[PDB]
Structure 1
Amino acid sequence: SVTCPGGQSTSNSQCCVWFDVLDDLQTNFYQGSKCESPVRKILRIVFHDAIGFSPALTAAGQFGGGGADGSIIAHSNIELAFPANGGLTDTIEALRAVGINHGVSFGDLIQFATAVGMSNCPGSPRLEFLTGRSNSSQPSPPSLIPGPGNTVTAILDRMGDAGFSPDEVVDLLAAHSLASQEGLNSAIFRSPLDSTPQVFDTQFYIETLLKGTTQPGPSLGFAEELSPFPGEFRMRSDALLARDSRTACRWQSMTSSNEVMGQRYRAAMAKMSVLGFDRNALTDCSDVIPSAVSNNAAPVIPGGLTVDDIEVSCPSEPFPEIATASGPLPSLAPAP
């Protein structure tokens, strides 16, 4: 039954070219299968590509955007001028070349590169991968990307129009577990959003709940808040969603289990991958995606801080009993 040229076995002949682009991305784009800046950048690109989809604009007789159509690469000239798309240019060019060389659509390539990039980061789930999205796209309308200075109401409305419930917004933010910022405060380039920028874990949800104590750089950048320790950056939207009554209980439930967070994240990502498409018209090639190494560390409140330093914001469920660490407060090095 279906064998691909290099001897691997797959479900459909349409999956076979993806074994070649897998080898190309691991060796080159990811510099030997690493979980560093290329993965983090690609996670911003899959979001910004897919969120340019608005049912409300369509209802008002306007082009609403094509969703995960690869338009961020095909119309990079228009989309990378948007304020939330800076710092992406070099990754988008690298991706353009791989797509053109392999003859795969840009929309599919961005979904594939997200699943494969995440597989290089310890603790990640194996994300679903479907192929068949048309290469044809039109530029996304402006103003459909959530920004770090927006209120929780604005983020929930924009995300809700695209199709996400408040819970799914929180689930989607597990990608900030492999994250840093470059452009909000360039004095502290690549300052991490959690203490493990290379491990897909629960620490991001825990650490954003901790009382902001520290200013990590010479001044505060755009939409920057006080964070819990030296080297960590905290953006305002993340601080607010952690504490807002609409999202706070789901945020709190993401703090004690890497398995729960992983499942919820994979589900939310599978929904985002087909915005603008019919998943029943795509071919499933998830078996091409390899496993990530497992994360064996327990969720912890870092460097001596206790449950008394968490700003518990879910009034109905008590805070999970998480482990504490007998250490001094951490200073975080830049994300690699």
Structure 2
Amino acid sequence: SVTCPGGQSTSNSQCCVWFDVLDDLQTNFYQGSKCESPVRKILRIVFHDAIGFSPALTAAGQFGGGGADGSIIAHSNIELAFPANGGLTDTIEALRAVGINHGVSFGDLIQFATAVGMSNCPGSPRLEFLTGRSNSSQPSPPSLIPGPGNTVTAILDRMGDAGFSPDEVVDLLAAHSLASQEGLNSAIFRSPLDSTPQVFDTQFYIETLLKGTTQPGPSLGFAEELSPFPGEFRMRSDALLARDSRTACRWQSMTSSNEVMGQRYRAAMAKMSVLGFDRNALTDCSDVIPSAVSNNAAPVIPGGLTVDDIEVSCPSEPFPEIATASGPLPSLAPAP
């Protein structure tokens, strides 16, 4: 409909400023449209920002949090002191400056930077992007972010309160396919959670189901489990969700199709992006988001492992026929 100053066509004039913050983020924050640590950090930030939302706290007369309101930036002084929020300061400051510089709300900017960062990573779906979230927020209540040492019941209850079913919790975890850890075991900084930390694929679901065989570092860190090969980190909550009867069959269904995984993740992320808001009050600017390059590799059980090495945990459906790789056990380099 509209033609923005830069000659791009868009659906609504409110979308035009987003082509300028697209260019700045690609050039600066993402260092030339790369899929490296800034994208992984933004993905952890969108989750920590949107999940500070609790209907139970509201019901009990308390402030339950505003959801996807950008409070992790506006109130970074209080939220970054939460233990779930370590390692985020530098990224929050960079985002703060872009927000102030372009005059966009912090809640909208975090949703936008997530859709743009994912477009830099092969295999990613185009995420929906809505604009209009109010820039005003209150600090998130503490203790609303799931931790790696929590039990599956604990995570499902917390997530359930925020609004997600057990299935959507599994769908949301596709983001650990572009992930590493830096603070659980600092001795193996940026150790990846799957073998392709730069490709949005099914490898994370396959690899967390393999038998934990290897200790990747000198000792075990906080909530660390044995992993399937050198260089890969496995955290307890992911190991447990892959195997718990409440989530095991959805986890297994996510292993053979990058197309089904991406559709499911896109839907759960659209839901998460409007926690605390009425999406009917927001303007759709999804056409601003570029396409990612496609991932053409098929799912594989890496380095010589076979089906016999995966701990099948869904009792009702057989494990999918996934390709095996004819090689020695990989050793993963740190995520870039």
Pick the TM interval, shorter chain: over 0.9
Distance 2:18 2:190 in 1: 31
Distance 2:41 2:217 in 1: 22
Q: Deviations over 1:264-322 (max 9, x none)?
A: 00000000000000000000000000000000000000000000000000000000000
Distance 1:164 1:267 in 2: 12
Q: Deviations over 1:56-111 (max 9, x none)?
A: 00000000000000000000000000000000000000000000000000000000
Q: Deviations over 1:14-48 (max 9, x none)?
A: 00000000000000000000000000000000000
Counterpart of 2:168 in structure 1 is 168
Q: Deviations over 1:149-198 (max 9, x none)?
A: 00000000000000000000000000000000000000000000000000
Distance 2:326 2:148 in 1: 33
Distance 1:236 1:151 in 2: 9
User: Kindly, what percent of the aligned residue pairs are identical?
Assistant: 100
Distance 2:214 2:17 in 1: 49
Shift of 1:201: 0.1
Shift of 1:239: 0.1
Q: Give secondary structure in 1 for the equivalent of 2:246.
A: coil
Distance 1:48 1:132 in 2: 20
Distance 2:108 2:285 in 1: 11
Pairs within 5 Å for 1:284-303: 284-303=284-303
Counterpart of 2:95 in structure 1 is 95
Q: Give secondary structure in 2 for the equivalent of 1:16.
A: helix
Shift of 1:215: 0.2
Is 1:11 aligned to residue 48 of structure 2?
A: no
Unmatched 5+ residue regions in structure 2? none
Shift of 1:50: 0.1
Distance 1:64 1:293 in 2: 39
Q: Give secondary structure in 1 for the equivalent of 2:315.
A: coil
Counterpart of 2:184 in structure 1 is 184
Instruction: Give the structure-1-normalised TM-score.
Output: 1.00
Q: Deviations over 1:191-220 (max 9, x none)?
A: 000000000000000000000000000000
Q: Give secondary structure in 2 for the equivalent of 1:219.
A: coil
Q: Give secondary structure in 2 for the equivalent of 1:330.
A: coil
Distance 1:297 1:137 in 2: 43
Distance 1:217 1:33 in 2: 31
Distance 2:191 2:263 in 1: 27
Distance 2:192 2:143 in 1: 26
Distance 1:264 1:325 in 2: 27
Distance 2:298 2:96 in 1: 39
Unmatched 5+ residue regions in structure 1? none
Distance 2:247 2:326 in 1: 31
Distance 1:247 1:112 in 2: 30
Q: Give secondary structure in 2 for the equivalent of 1:73.
A: helix
Distance 2:225 2:213 in 1: 9
Following superposition, which runs of at least 4 residues in structure 1 exceed 3 angstroms of deviation?
A: none
Q: Give secondary structure in 2 for the equivalent of 1:205.
A: helix
Instruction: Give the structure-2-normalised TM-score.
Output: 1.00
Q: What's the C-alpha RMSD, in Å, of the aligned pairs?
A: 0.3
Counterpart of 2:35 in structure 1 is 35
